[PDB]
Design a protein around this ligand. Structure first.
Ligand SMILES: N[C@@H](CC(=O)O)C(=O)O
Ligand SMILES: N[C@@H](CC(=O)O)C(=O)O
Ligand SMILES: N[C@@H](CC(=O)O)C(=O)O
Lengths: 402, 401, 402
């Protein structure tokens, strides 16, 4: 566990530097090695998505793809709704807040791109997913054609994407060799920057939020995994490279390459499931963001002395799940969509309003909460993949046996 | 003809909704299914162009490509010039109007500065130039004496060949949804502009649509019979692209289905239809030229300054010249119509009522965009069969009952 | 030498037209045939880079790639530093000037792209180089795998890039058939436009700068080439297509396709060296830009009567080499980065001081100096490739024997 050692050592180094006022030295000396690690992984996000979906979709019939697609969507929505429920529980238990819209139809239509090459250039995950899935379905239909020229043309096209997919998986393994320094550098800069703001009432928010994410892993991804027969301890131990990487990169879409490599080289999941459930889940399944939004909504409301009612806590659950899909896999994306959650309950943010000062207080520790959010936003993607794969008999039983 | 049934049923539904003031309900309930249909076809425009040109150009020698290229350009210019002539005839008969980019730089823009940027920016002409020479280079490498170069070129062509067949397969799947997309698209357009066609604007719509109907049956029915191609079979076979262009209102948008129809219903070799269709989708728009001819007289007659006989000839050259300028996007004919009006001297100013007549046309621009795109792709199909017949690339079995 | 004949004939035609005031006719009649030539070559820059690096890197083991990479960087920095030294010598000898910042760490991090498809769309050479090199390294590792499916998938992926590379090399040969008209048109317009501004003190700058570039070729690329055994006369004669093309296109990145074709079809250099040293050198190795900056810094200083001291001439050398990497392979890129060189020595540019007046005077003949700059910015890339190839035994001895 050398990678995990860097996270603990870097946090101590960041706290020591932050307490001694050495944040400036770390920002211009250590961080540049953390930024290189983020850029290396963010580079492989697009090639590993276009290649994996085409090979993954072409390896299974469209009938099984529909069953797998519907199955994971129910899990994604149920876990996201459960995550918001946990957020209200931990927020009320800790009593946070003591002192002191995009079109839904247009968002669905945006799944279908107007230019597949522009979506790759613009770094859009969902439009690429739609184009690559139907490309894989079209490829596997051409391989069943009676003509020999069409069959060989489709095989050559798939081999290019198959060779591209294996190339990216190989590069990720090389990149993670540098992760022992990238993880150490990333956590050191974040700890040094925000090692002081967590002093008073903001500390209760961090404690309440992090308690919810910890409970979410061991009550939602430990009970459901045991129901379907997957060992929870093995799942957490195997998926520690993506959990640590998401805990430093703070971008679920950013830590997509390593999540794909871990899900297939450590869990034995077929390419027809993990290649589809991971990128789609990286854009629509973020339980940590939903749980964080639940706590902060109560924190903002309790700061201005207008706590949510029992009925008001139910409408905010639906919006939090709805806003969860809206958030992208980029750092600091949960605070932007948190405004829509606050406006849903009626707490509009006005330039000098009290609800616009509690919002600024959250943004002070937004990065320290972004770390916990991304840690579980990819764990749910992995946990759902094993659950769906177990029901589809695509799990490799040898990989889960000591 | 289930697809054609949706167009007629949707028009009735749109007229009923528009007359009862239910345009708001259609815009937020029905249009979203039409927008999905447009996005599905617009997605396949770029992959179906890059893959088809490479395979199409590599399947024939460059000598035949030059003969085919020159042959269709003469047809494209002759039909466009004829289309403007029809527009003046129908405009004068109906008595409508009762109540600049560098040319050299445009030609230089055909050669891209970055092939990947052209694909990302959705440019058809720069992609055409790069893909044609890529296909020519590929077919030259396959004739090399070295074995490694020959296999490398074959693998590169098979990737584009597999990509081309994949897009053609996806189009067939998309057109299964066209029974709902066409119905939704025509319903929203009819509901939105079912009231503005009431008075003098109705005469413009009648005069313009008469010209496009006459253009199909006098230009694409006489020339097709001269070269031996049956006109009735051509119209019946190319009804999927005609209907799709009549709802999408974007010739570049309805390029995928036009390619699939031209090869799975007409038996045209990939070396002709893959080249003549995208190039024609950017430079051959007879409906736009015919529409511009009628509206120029309508604008002039509205302000009481009719064009003279000499003034009607200079406006013909500009209309053909402005026809190439228009892109395959909705509402692109009105933007370039300003250049046609300024050519004859009718500059648009906020003070003069010249801009007032221009604004009146924009009110029914979408209802005229539907007829324009309907023939802008028919001419691309009609020219392809004419060129293919002269090149003996037409499949005679596909044109025999 | 028909191509070289057009350059001489076009210069005479441009001078005659410029002297008679016929620059307007040439700009709207002749230049458009030169612009077509530039667009044709600029189109092939990206496909010839992505395809060549992948095939070049996969053809050799990563151990040899590191040795070649380090070897050429030392040559690139040594020649660039030598070029600035020559600029001060010719500038002081001619006595020019008689009358009258981007982050370094961020620039290095920008080598690793965040989206490989966006880098291709945005026309970035260095980010594409990094992605294509590791893609080639990953491909050659997959071909050594024990599995048969992975081996065939990697071979198919390489054959696509191999077929793409040979296609671009074939297109360049076709484009250079038109170069007899493109070179004539390009040089005619430039000569006609700036055939009058070279009259007085600006003529001394052109003479001093062009003397330095001529001396650089015959003292730096003629002594070092003879040391390693490569004939200097054969190198210049063979690499005359790229030298002339760079002398009209005025963009080293623009004249990358022909430089690649000349380096492999006339010098017998393996694809693992020239495909890597040329595009990297087209962005970081510009000796002509460095030599031009050295002369103009003294010219600007001497114009305002504040000549550089002996110590001040050494700090300006380091910045000129540092600013040399900053310049891109586009026309007029040396004047933009020349401001940083002037500010390094203390000569900040202000509208009031005549420092900007001397800078504006240089911009008047910037294009006539851009021609000489690009002529040697690609010669150094070619000269370094043969030197590195000779040490790696990848040079074809048959191509260098009459
Ligand atoms: N940065 C988080 C989203 C958030 O800000 O909540 C992620 O990528 O998962
Ligand atoms: N939208 C039309 C052009 C026009 O507006 O006339 C087309 O794509 O063909
Ligand atoms: N245009 C030159 C750079 C410069 O302006 O000095 C080149 O591409 O090499």
């Amino acid at each position: 566990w050398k990678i995990l050692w860097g996270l603990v050592l870097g946090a101590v180094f960041g706290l020591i530097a932050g307490h001694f006022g050495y944040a400036g030295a770390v920002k211009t000396y250590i961080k540049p090695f953390g930024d290189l690690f983020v850029r290396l992984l963010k580079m492989l996000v697009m090639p590993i998505v276009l290649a994996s979906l085409v090979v993954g979709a072409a390896s299974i019939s469209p009938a099984r793809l529909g069953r797998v697609g519907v199955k994971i969507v129910v899990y994604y929505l149920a876990t996201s709704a459960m995550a918001v429920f946990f957020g209200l529980i931990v927020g009320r238990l800790f009593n946070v807040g003591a002192n002191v819209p995009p079109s839904l139809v247009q968002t669905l239509l945006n799944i279908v791109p107007t230019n597949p090459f522009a979506s790759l250039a613009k770094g859009e995950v969902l439009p690429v997913i739609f184009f690559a899935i139907i490309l894989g379905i079209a490829i596997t239909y051409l391989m069943n054609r009676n003509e020999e020229r069409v069959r060989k043309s489709a095989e050559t096209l798939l081999r290019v994407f198959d060779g591209l997919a294996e190339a990216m998986y190989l590069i990720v393994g090389g990149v993670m060799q540098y992760a022992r320094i990238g993880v150490f550098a990333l956590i050191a800069y974040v700890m040094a920057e925000q090692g002081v703001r967590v002093v008073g009432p903001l500390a209760k928010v961090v404690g309440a939020v992090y308690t919810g994410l910890f409970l979410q892993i061991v009550i939602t991804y430990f009970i459901l995994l045991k129901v379907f027969g997957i060992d929870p301890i093995k799942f957490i131990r195997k998926a520690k490279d993506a959990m640590i990487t998401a805990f430093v990169t703070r971008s679920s879409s950013g830590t997509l390459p390593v999540t794909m490599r871990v899900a297939e080289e450590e869990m034995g999941v077929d390419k027809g499931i993990f290649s589809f459930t991971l990128p789609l889940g990286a854009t629509i399944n973020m339980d940590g963001t939903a749980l964080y939004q639940g706590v902060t909504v109560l924190f903002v409301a309790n700061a201005i002395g207008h706590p949510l009612t029992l009925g008001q806590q139910l409408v905010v659950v639906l919006t939090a799940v709805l806003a969860s899909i809206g958030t992208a896999g980029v750092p600091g994306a949960g605070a932007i969509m948190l405004a829509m959650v606050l406006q849903s309950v009626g707490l509009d943010l006005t330039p000098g309003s009290p609800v616009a000062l509690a919002y600024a207080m959250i943004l002070g520790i937004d990065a320290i909460l972004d770390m916990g959010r991304t840690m579980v936003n990819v764990t749910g993607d992995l946990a759902g993949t094993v659950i769906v794969a177990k029901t589809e008999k695509e799990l490799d039983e040898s990989k889960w046996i000591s």
